[PDB]
Amino acid sequence: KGDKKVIQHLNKILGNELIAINQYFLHSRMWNDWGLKRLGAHEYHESIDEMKHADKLIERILFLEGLPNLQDLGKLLIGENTQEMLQCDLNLELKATKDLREAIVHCEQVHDYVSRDLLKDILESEEEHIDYLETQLGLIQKVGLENYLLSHMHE
Amino acid sequence: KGDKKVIQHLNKILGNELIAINQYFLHSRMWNDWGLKRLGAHEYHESIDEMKHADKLIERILFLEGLPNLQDLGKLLIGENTQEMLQCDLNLELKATKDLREAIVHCEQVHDYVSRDLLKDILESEEEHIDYLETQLGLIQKVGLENYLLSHMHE
Amino acid sequence: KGDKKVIQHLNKILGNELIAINQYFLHSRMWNDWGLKRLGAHEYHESIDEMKHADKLIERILFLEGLPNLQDLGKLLIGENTQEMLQCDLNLELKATKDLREAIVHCEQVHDYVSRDLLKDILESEEEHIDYLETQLGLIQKVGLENYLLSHMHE
Amino acid sequence: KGDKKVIQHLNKILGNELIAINQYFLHSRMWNDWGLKRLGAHEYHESIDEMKHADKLIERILFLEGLPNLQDLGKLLIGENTQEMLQCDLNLELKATKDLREAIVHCEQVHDYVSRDLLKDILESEEEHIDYLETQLGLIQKVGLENYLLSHMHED
Amino acid sequence: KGDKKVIQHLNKILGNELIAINQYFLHSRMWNDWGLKRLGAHEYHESIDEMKHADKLIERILFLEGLPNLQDLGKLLIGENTQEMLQCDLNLELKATKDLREAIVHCEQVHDYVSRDLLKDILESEEEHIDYLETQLGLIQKVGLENYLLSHMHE
Amino acid sequence: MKGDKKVIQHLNKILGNELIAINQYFLHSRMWNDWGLKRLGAHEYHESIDEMKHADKLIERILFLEGLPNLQDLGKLLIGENTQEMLQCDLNLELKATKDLREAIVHCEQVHDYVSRDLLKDILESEEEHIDYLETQLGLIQKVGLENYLLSHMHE
Amino acid sequence: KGDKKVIQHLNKILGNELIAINQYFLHSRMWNDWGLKRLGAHEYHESIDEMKHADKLIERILFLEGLPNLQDLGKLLIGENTQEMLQCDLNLELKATKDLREAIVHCEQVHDYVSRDLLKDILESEEEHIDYLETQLGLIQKVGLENYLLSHMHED
Ligand code: HEM
Ligand code: HEM
Ligand code: HEM
Ligand code: HEM
């Protein structure tokens, strides 16, 4: 059986993935509705990536004889325009990585090194998303909003 | 022999398709003349799609032993710039979908379910065109008119 | 800008093409409705050919800074049986070639040699259609109406 | 579980399909026996098409927990010559589409939209058959009977 | 012209084939509905084989200048569970082969050797079906009903 | 062309049902995989994917109609504790889903939103196919016994 | 021998082609130097097309037993920025087509129909270049100069 606090941490990370799946999927379809197809496609792939993380977390929790929690869905940060949507994704990711670091600390302490390795792989993927997000927000500043949107119309 | 009012409704839809064929073809060639080749190509494909709908309507009318009316051509809405042309297409499509809905109501009432199915397929295609048009008009607001035209110069 | 009377002549030829498109398309679908698929298929190709001429005329008018007229649709000559439909097509083409010759005369007078060359190419296509029509009407006389229809049932 | 009257309508349409299978299959083989191979082949495909509709109806009735009725075979309309055979097929199809419309009305009323969609697909196929049949009868008038039969001796 | 009693015999065998087509097709679709897909698929192929026999019988009757009887449909033996359905198929086949033998005797007596050969080919197919049916009923005894059904779940 | 306000409410209701089914079927899939019932785990995975695709189409339709898709409200997951309960939980969810779909289609018809009706009818056919699978599986447990049924679903 | 005035007209058109070859080639390389590679590539192709017209005129003059004049090079219209370069090309083409029409009139008058056909083919190609140039100048007005240049930085 797994450590009770490891399973709590894994369920907390899973909860964050479930928010991100839905937030990124809606943002993707919003961008597609507006004709910003390059943003819509990239955001769809971000949503798929979170779906795959959730899958791996669910599988680990079950192996450890815990109960995966897919019932509690936290608050989606839905923006009303491109700049707010990107900032909402970044705010979500900054919370996501804080929780990941706390979970890894606990895994190391109780010697659950396989759970730590899984979380470290998720953390790397979220830091890559932060890299993308900070880059997009900087580009809006460097080229202007209307030029940035123009750049993201075509796939 | 088909229901007389069904044939009248089908000839009304056909009349709307005939307006749309010519309006979209002219808009296409105006955009090509101006060097906005992406818009010209998309609009050509819209005109072709209306040609295919008119064909299916003609065939259905003849099967029902009615007389297809290709003689009466209503008013083309020709715009003077890119935004107005898109808005003219949208005004035409909003009228077309109203007429399609009224035609479908009558087909259902007289149990002409095959005519209804044909009209619903056309209606879905016209709503996809509305989706394109509202998206383009929204992009003009979001990226600016000159940027929008810039994006539609090359195929 | 193009010559004002050249553009009027090009719009007149365009109007003739627009009549022919619809007349041949309806005749095609009537023959298909009747199971005369060889005639229906041939007439369909005649309609497509007039569509392509209309396109070239629209493009030339716009280059010359004129306004293509797709709004005014003249009288369709719709037959009620095969022999009448063929004679109607022949009557329309004889009017078309008369107008083409008058347009070519004017283009030569004002030295619009490229418009003349475009119109000469259309004229050759219309004379090929006259060749087909006169041949079909001659076959009806040579084999009889029922044998002619029999020959045109299968594609 | 399915609506009882929906299941009754579906079995009624199934009964019509079972008549058409047999009528078209026999007309097909009669035309082949006479050397009118183009007619025989087309009529064979109409029979196969009805077999597929009957299959989908059987499958739907079973899903809805009804009993498919393959026991009751109504009256086959068999012609004695080509012109009669085509009119017999047309008469059968006109009855079939009347029954299809009444079944669709009832499915709509009780919100069985999937059964309605199946019946609408069958109806489109039967109306295509009416188009073929009315066209053939029109051709007999336009070219004459002997020329029409001549046109249908060889297959495509 | 064919012998009158040969034509009666052929119409009787055809009548048996028409029963089997419907009985096997219904049994096939019942097994599919229950998820016994191996039984459903095999029973489908049995129905198709009887359809082909009916076709050969119809063609022979017409060649002999008889009237094929597709109007009279005898009693379908429909079971309520797998063991009853298999026994119903066997009962039908035992009657079918009895009738086939009587038809062959009469064909031999009147020297209709081509009709005899066709009927013998059908008889061989029906005995192959009896072999299948007796083998399945024996397997139910040897492995038990639940194991037998388990074996026929997957195609 | 703004959507009917009640149409958008119905579409958001169906979307909410799809979101429950995605999570319920995904968890059931991974439970069956954890238990080594790989054939059930794989089939249930594909059911979850199918609901994801329906949710996508509903989100797209709502946005086109200028509504706000609701991905925030997640209703109650019906999670079973063994194979037979899990299948019955899926079936209970699907019966509720098809009831809501029928009511949404009724309203779409009333306000002449025929494209939304067609989308919902396509989803309805897919959910009725899932009901077919589930009722068949529960019938097989009764026909072959629970242990034989589980044995049959160990290997993919 | 050919008609003396026909040969003079053909040499006049040849002279116009020789100006255009050099003007378009230099404009092409100026655009490439500035990093406006789409304009540079298009203008290179315009220069090649004029070289091919010059070739056909030389061949026709020699067949007619005239002397092709490749010695006299008239005034190149070289712009100092993109907008001036396009207008310089347009000014040259409007002069070229005027001379082409005058040459065709004369060929018709003396019944040199093959020379007329050659000149009409050149005229169609020059009117296509006018179409391109007017469209580009219009695009500058519709998108603004900086956006137009932006659109022409990268080749296809
Ligand atoms: C202003 C009037 C029209 C113009 C300028 C026009 C132009 C065209 C052109 C350029 C094509 C492509 C031909 C090719 O290159 O193969 C085409 C195709 C076609 N047109 Fe038209 N057309 C017109 C009216 C119509 C009408 C009134 C109908 C029917 C009633 C129609 C039916 C069709 C069909 C069925 C095709 C083939 C589409 C496909 O399957 O790809 N057209 N048309
Ligand atoms: C007089 C009765 C029938 C005759 C003579 C007949 C004849 C045939 C024949 C010759 C074939 C083609 C077999 C092959 O060579 O592959 C066929 C196929 C088929 N039959 Fe029948 N049939 C009859 C009744 C039925 C009935 C009552 C049904 C269903 C309720 C049915 C369902 C089917 C199906 C589903 C196929 C396969 C069609 C395809 O997918 O191509 N048949 N039939
Ligand atoms: C518990 C939440 C979810 C989980 C665990 C999950 C899991 C997955 C997985 C594992 C895949 C396959 C990824 C791959 O390897 O390519 C997938 C695909 C997909 N998901 Fe999800 N998903 C969830 C929620 C959602 C939601 C809420 C939506 C839409 C609103 C959605 C839409 C999609 C779509 C469109 C695909 C691609 C399906 C295809 O076309 O093949 N998913 N999901
Ligand atoms: C003055 C009279 C000229 C004539 C009659 C002439 C003729 C031609 C011809 C016939 C071609 C081949 C075209 C083809 O079919 O692809 C050609 C190619 C070419 N020309 Fe000229 N040309 C002339 C002047 C020039 C000048 C002044 C330049 C440069 C400053 C030039 C640069 C080129 C280049 C780079 C090619 C392509 C060579 C290759 O890479 O194959 N030409 N010319």
From Swiss-Prot, chain F:
Listed cofactors: heme b
Catalytic activity: 4 Fe(2+) + O2 + 4 H(+) = 4 Fe(3+) + 2 H2O; Fe(2+)(in) = Fe(2+)(out)
Lineage: superkingdom: Bacteria
Positions that bind K(+): 148, 151
Top-tier EC class: oxidoreductase
EC code(s) of this entry: 1.16.3.1
Record's note on what induces expression: 24-fold increase in transcription in response to iron treatment.
Sequence positions that bind heme b: 52
GO MF annotation list: ferric iron binding; ferroxidase activity; heme binding; iron ion binding; iron ion sequestering activity
Effect ascribed to mutating residue 68 to A: Assembles into normal BFR with wild-type ability to oxidize Fe(2+) and store Fe(3+), 5.2-fold decrease in rate of iron release from BRF, greatly reduced affinity for Bfd
Biological process according to GO: intracellular iron ion homeostasis; iron ion transport
Applications: Small molecules designed to bind BfrB at the Bfd binding site (derivatives of 4-aminoisoindoline-1,3-dione) cause cell death in model biofilms, and are bacteriostatic in planktonic cells, suggesting these compounds are potential antibiotics. Model biofilms were tested in strains PAO1, PA_1081725 and PA_1076058.
Pfam families, A to Z: Ferritin
Annotated binding of Fe(2+) Fe1, by residue: 18, 51, 54, 127
Domain Ferritin-like diiron: 1-145
Keywords on record: Cytoplasm, Heme, Ion transport, Iron, Iron storage, Iron transport, Metal-binding, Oxidoreductase, Potassium, Transport
Gene Ontology terms: cellular component: cytosol; ferritin complex
Location of the protein in the cell: Cytoplasm
UniProt family annotation: Belongs to the bacterioferritin family.
Note: The unstable catalytic diiron-binding site within each subunit (Fe1 and Fe2, ferroxidase center) also serves as a pore for iron uptake; the ferroxidase center is labile. In the iron-loaded BRF crystal structure additional stably-bound iron ions are seen inside close to the ferroxidase pore. Mutagenesis of residues reveals other stably bound Fe cations in the interior of the BFR shell; they may represent a pathway followed by Fe(3+) to the central iron storage core.
Function: The major iron-storage protein, part of the heterooligomeric bacterioferritin (BFR) complex. The ferroxidase center binds Fe(2+), oxidizes it using dioxygen to Fe(3+), and participates in the subsequent Fe(3+) oxide mineral core formation within the central cavity of the BFR protein shell. Can store up to 600 iron atoms per bacterioferritin protein molecule.
Oligomeric and partner information: The bacterioferritin (BFR) complex is formed of 24 subunits (FtnA and BfrB) arranged as 12 homodimers. The holocomplex contains about 8.7% Fe and 8.0% phosphate. A pure BfrB BFR is a hollow shell with an external diameter of 118 Angstroms and an internal diameter of 73 Angstroms that binds 12 heme molecules and up to 600 Fe(3+) ions per subunit. The BfrB-only BFR has twenty-four ferroxidase pores which serve as a conduit for Fe(2+).
Full protein name: Bacterioferritin BfrB
